[PDB]
Amino acid sequence: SSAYPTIERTLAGISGILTGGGIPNIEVIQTEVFNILNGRADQIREFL
Amino acid sequence: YQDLIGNRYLELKRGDSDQILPPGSTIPVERTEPALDLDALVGGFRPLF
C-alpha cells in the first residue's frame, strides 16, 4: 500500500529546494560566466 | 492543505517512541511544521527565472 505525492507535497519540496538551496547565487554565477565568454571563445580555444 | 481554496487541517504522525504523552501536554515547535506557504514558493522562482 502506498500513496501518490500530493500537489502540496510536491510544491513544498520544490519550495524547500528554492529557498534552502541558494538559488539567487546562480544569477550571479551565470552572469560572471557570461563576462568570461563574451567575445573571447576563439581566443580561449587558441589559448587551450 | 485540504484543497486549493484555502481550507487546512491538522495531521498527526505517531512517530517511533512508545512513551505515552500524558493528556493535556504540548508538542514543541521542534516537531511541528507549517503548510505549503504558496507565496514563498512563487517568490522563490524569481531568481531562477
Structure summarized in a few sentences:
By secondary structure, chain A is mainly α. Chain A is 73% helix and 0% strand.
Features of this protein?
part of a larger assembly; 2 chains; A: 48 residues; mainly alpha; B: 49 residues; 22% helix; membrane protein; Membrane protein complex; ABC transporter; Virulence factor; Lipid transport
Structural class of chain B: mainly alpha
- Assembly level: part of a larger assembly
What are the secondary-structure elements of chain B, in order, as H or E? H
Q: Give the CA-based shape of chain B.
A: elongated
Structural class category of chain A: mainly alpha
> Main interface pair?
A-B, 13 and 12 residues
Our measurement of the CA-to-CA distance between the termini of chain A, rounded to an integer number of angstroms, reads 57 Å
Cα-atom Rg of chain A, whole angstroms? Answer: 20 Å
Protein name (chain A): Virulence factor Mce family protein
Organism (chain A): Mycolicibacterium smegmatis (strain ATCC 700084 / mc(2)155) (Mycobacterium smegmatis)
Protein name (chain B): Virulence factor Mce family protein
Organism (chain B): Mycolicibacterium smegmatis (strain ATCC 700084 / mc(2)155)
